[PDB]
Design a protein around this ligand. Structure first.
Ligand SMILES: [Ca+2]
Length: 228
C-alpha cells in the first residue's frame, strides 16, 4: 500500500529534516538522522521525522488516532532511537517508543552495545509518572509491526504481538510524531553526550559512539485521526 497523503502531502504532518526526503518511493518512508541531521533547541541528538502540525493539535483526550506500520531497523551496536511519540505542549512527553541497544535495565535484553535492540514503550500516567514496558527485541536488519493507538486519552502500543496501554496525562496541545530520533547517549553509562543546539557536538558524539548506521524504514503505513 502507498504512503497516505496526510503524510506525503503535508495535510497533517510537518517534516523535520528536509534532506533527504523520507519518501523514497510511493510506498516507502526512510528515516536517516545521520543524513538529515535535523536539530531542535532542546533536542539531544539528530532526527528525521514527521510531526502533526501545530494548527491541528488538541488535547490527548480530544482525539482518536491510530498509527500503524511495518518497521525495519538497521543500526549500529549501541544505538538508541525514538521511532514514535506523543509530545506535550512544553518539553513534556506523553508516549515514546524506543529501539535501543543500551544497558538500561527492565527489558528483555538490557545489555549495552551487543547488537540486540530492546523495543519498548514509556507512557506517562495521569500522575505524571512514566510506566515502561518491554515489547520485544530485534537485531539490525529485522522488521516488526508497530501499532500505536490514542483512544481519547487511553494510549496503547502493540509490537511483536505484545500490547500495553494505560490512560495518560492529558495535554491541551498534544501531537504525534514518528520517524527516527537518534539519541546522543552512551549505551553503557546512559550519560547524555553533546550540547543542545550544537549540531557539530552531536556529529562528534555519534562518531565516537560508533553510530555510523541508523535507518528506520516504514512500509504499509496507516494513520487515522478523528478530532471532536
Ligand atoms: Ca542490547
Amino acid at each position: 500500500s502507498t504512503i497516505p497523503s496526510s503524510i506525503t502531502s503535508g495535510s497533517i504532518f510537518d517534516l523535520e529534516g528536509d534532506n533527504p526526503n523520507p519518501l523514497v518511493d510511493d510506498s516507502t518512508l526512510v528515516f536517516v538522522p545521520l543524513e538529515a541531521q535535523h536539530i531542535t533547541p532542546n533536542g539531544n541528538g539528530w532526527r528525521h521525522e514527521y510531526k502533526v502540525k501545530e494548527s491541528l493539535r488538541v488535547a490527548m483526550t480530544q482525539t482518536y488516532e491510530v498509527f500503524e506500520a511495518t518497521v525495519k531497523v538497521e543500526m549500529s551496536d549501541g544505538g538508541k532511537t525514538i521511532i514514535s511519540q506523543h509530545h506535550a505542549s512544553d518539553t513534556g512527553t506523553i508516549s515514546k517508543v524506543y529501539v535501543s541497544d543500551t544497558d538500561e535495565s527492565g527489558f528483555n535484553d538490557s545489555v549495552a552495545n551487543n547488537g540486540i535492540f530492546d523495543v519498548y514503550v514509556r507512557l506517562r500516567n495521569t500522575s505524571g509518572n512514566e510506566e515502561k514496558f518491554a515489547l520485544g527485541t530485534m537485531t539490525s536488519g529485522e522488521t516488526f509491526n508497530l501499532r500505536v493507538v490514542n483512544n481519547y486519552g487511553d494510549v496503547e502500543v502493540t509490537a511483536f504481538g505484545n500490547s500495553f496501554g494505560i490512560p495518560v496525562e492529558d495535554d491541551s496541545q498534544s501531537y504525534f510524531k514518528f520517524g527516527n530520533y537518534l539519541q546522543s547517549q552512551d549505551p553503557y553509562t546512559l550519560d547524555k553526550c553533546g550540547e543542545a543546539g550544537n549540531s557539530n557536538s552531536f556529529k562528534n558524539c555519534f562518531e565516537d559512539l560508533g553510530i555510523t548506521e541508523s535507518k528506520v524504514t516504514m512500509t504499509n503505513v496507516t494513520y487515522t485521526r478523528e478530532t471532536n
